[PDB]
Design a protein around this ligand. Structure first.
Ligand SMILES: C=C[C@@]1(C)CC(=O)[C@]2(O)[C@@]3(C)[C@@H](O)CCC(C)(C)[C@@H]3[C@H](O)[C@H](OC(C)=O)[C@@]2(C)O1
Ligand SMILES: C=C[C@@]1(C)CC(=O)[C@]2(O)[C@@]3(C)[C@@H](O)CCC(C)(C)[C@@H]3[C@H](O)[C@H](OC(C)=O)[C@@]2(C)O1
Lengths: 176, 177
């Protein structure tokens, strides 16, 4: 009867998607009607998850995946954790790369990062899911969906905090 | 990669497209918390339909934000008519009626935008951390497309599924009803 909620302020949320994966996936003979593609995707995600085990990213929290899109976040308990999220996205790229050269593919990550206040919480009676709701999230997501392949799009606000840390963000502020 | 294969499963993407506009985070809004409570109320009410014998064959895959994803046909007892496609339409009507009972109690005017499609699907769990089950495939990406390109308060359905629906009794424009 009670809605499980906890508010957090200043959490960096990332939406790391592989926009060309929907084109790749095919279903027919060679693929086994899709099964070969899901295995690759399963391979890609499980490899990304493996980064979470690195002490370097002990503060990163995988929320879940939406299809091939990966959602993570630092801050679920200033700026260090915002810089950690950028290091994690770089780490996702490098893992996607190690996969592209083993599976003979050319996948590219399109990351969208943003920080701010958030409300984590569980919705629904059957099959309850823990999301991160809010505007900083819908904006983190917007950075991704309007982002650029192989690049990390970041809002004007977050770009500054990043500079405070050391990341030179190209001005539409991107980073690599 | 645990996976299973199913042929002919009706998958529905029932979304509330105006909810993103509604949501806000202010003084008179509890920085969003009041909105999540409404959404939590809307989803938990939808889930309550699954308990109806009428929909014992309906299975909730997940919700994506405010979007609800369900499906008939995943019943896994190695049996491989088009009744379960008609069940999915009855379930979407049922989501509308529950959304309505909520609009009149919370003084809102939310509208559901449903996308239904049937076909072969691969249910499976992906990811080491927070592994999550789904329904992958083209019938799914199409069920989804029916939703995302759908019309408020209407159920968009592909040419193929529209026919099966007529075989069952559903009036079909060029949208079930
Ligand atoms: C519920 C609120 C609102 C407005 C804000 C929000 O946090 C979201 O739930 C996120 C961003 C957020 O929950 C992260 C997951 C996902 C799937 C990316 C959501 C959707 O984009 C939602 O939009 C829809 C239409 O569900 C959105 C944007 O809706
Ligand atoms: C992984 C495969 C592929 C190509 C096919 C598929 O089944 C999907 O995973 C669904 C449709 C499917 O898993 C149902 C949930 C949701 C959220 C609707 C998925 C996304 O639209 C995926 O797209 C993305 C871009 O992640 C998509 C379409 O990607």
């Amino acid at each position: 009867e009670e809605l499980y909620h906890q508010s957090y302020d200043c959490v960096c949320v990332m939406f790391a998607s592989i926009p060309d994966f929907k084109e790749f996936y095919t279903e027919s003979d060679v693929n086994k009607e899709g099964l070969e593609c899901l295995r690759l995707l399963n391979e890609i995600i499980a490899d990304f998850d493996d980064l979470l085990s690195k002490p370097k990213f002990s503060g990163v929290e995988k929320i879940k995946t939406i299809g091939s899109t990966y959602m993570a976040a630092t801050g679920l308990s200033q700026y260090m954790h915002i810089g950690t999220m950028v290091e994690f996205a770089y780490a996702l790229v490098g893992k996607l790369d190690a996969i592209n050269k083993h599976s003979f593919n050319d996948f590219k990550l399109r990351v969208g990062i943003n920080h701010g206040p958030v409300i984590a919480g569980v919705i629904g009676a059957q099959k309850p899911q823990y999301d991160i709701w809010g505007n900083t999230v819908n904006v983190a997501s917007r950075m991704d969906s309007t982002g650029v392949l192989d690049k990390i799009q970041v809002t004007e606000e977050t770009s500054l905090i990043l500079q405070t840390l050391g990341y030179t963000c190209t001005c539409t502020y991107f980073v690599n």
